[PDB]
Symmetry: C5
Subunit: 105 residues, 5 copies
């Protein structure tokens, strides 16, 4: 597939909606790293993703639990998710950075 860089920043009041325009193209979001930004203090941060499960209902899943003094970056190794996907902070002020690839076949 074609491969484009993806990223976003999450905050307590800022989520991210990944949606792709309808067309003759199949899209995947492949998540790589979740990293705490400066401004996360030392509070617990939990990042969640919401998208469709196999049985056709939205589910919310926890991608990572981070804390600056313990584990500031988690590497997901290319966690692919079919859009639409919402990414949000379940707790923590943020910022939390997300990186990955937007794959198009």
């Amino acid at each position: 597939p074609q491969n484009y860089l993806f990223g976003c920043e999450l905050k307590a009041d800022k989520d991210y909606h990944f949606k792709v325009d309808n067309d003759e193209n199949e899209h995947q979001l492949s998540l790589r790293t979740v990293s705490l930004g400066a401004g996360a203090k030392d509070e617990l941060h939990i990042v969640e993703a919401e998208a469709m499960n196999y049985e056709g209902s939205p589910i919310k899943v926890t991608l990572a639990t981070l804390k600056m003094s313990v584990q500031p970056t988690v590497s997901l190794g290319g966690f692919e998710i079919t859009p639409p996907v919402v990414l949000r902070l379940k707790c923590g002020s943020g910022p939390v950075h997300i990186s990955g690839q937007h794959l198009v076949a």
Copy 2:
């Protein structure tokens, strides 16, 4: 191969059974991360998966050992398991979250 989002929550008194209707061989659970929940205490948490070995018997294996002050998240990198699978906390009260993909072959 279609790809759907998967996750579950585990607690001391709550496991998770991943099962599929008919063609178990066309389905794979691909585990990504095991994460401690908000509200988990700082005790040792150990997560276990139970599924079939080649010899045809269920076996119990340890997926991850976590502790809030040391390692609150473990990334498994797409550990595929053929259903049925049971996921449970062997140790700790949780909540512990698991995320991954439910992959379906065509």
Copy 3:
């Protein structure tokens, strides 16, 4: 796609694990995923080794992971495939140490 079965074992000082497959027409691989310390392990260094054949036709020993409860209780290997036979053991530390992975069989 190969068939995929679950694999795991527990290691202790003086308790290793021999993974071997019976003869057949198929190709087998052991794909190692995680190494994790178990409850009650001493908070000391644990070193896990794997033994299997090298390219030159001799069994060799390699270190898969170094773990310690208060620092790094789990290491994820990401699917380290090894052709059987494989012997897994603790080179040091009390254990218990758990290993998980997949037994892949291509027909």
Copy 4:
């Protein structure tokens, strides 16, 4: 596809440009690890990559947050990016090292 080793060192005010090559081959940069170098201090380091998004515009993303006393190395597992790519330290003085593979389809 041919496989070549790639690496760079980043510092404050010292970034890296992985440039479109002057050939008609297909190229990918696949990032493997980001690691703090000797002499890096214990401040937060944030490493960023800039490259083209799906819509055609350049974007800046965070690859890793590192701190010597907590997490001196992050493994990305083969994060492929299409050139051109700029790698830089957003925060921290470094040195920070990046390693990976230059993949070429000829």
Copy 5:
């Protein structure tokens, strides 16, 4: 699918590792999996580097991992493939540091 053999080496301030082959280098890949501090390693910074050919055809040195016993004694590289010849060495620290991985061989 390539033949898949086990690979490992030990590094020390004392000792590096040269991975080389006598036949066609392009049929071989070293796929690195883990870098781990050994028993006997102290708590100083350890930095492991690899040296191998870049696209332009000259040798380049890269850092594979930075380890410290009290912080991060093992780094998993997830199958970092390199074409021989390759040299692995400690740039910093006295070790021992162990490396494990796969030696992959293309079948003609």
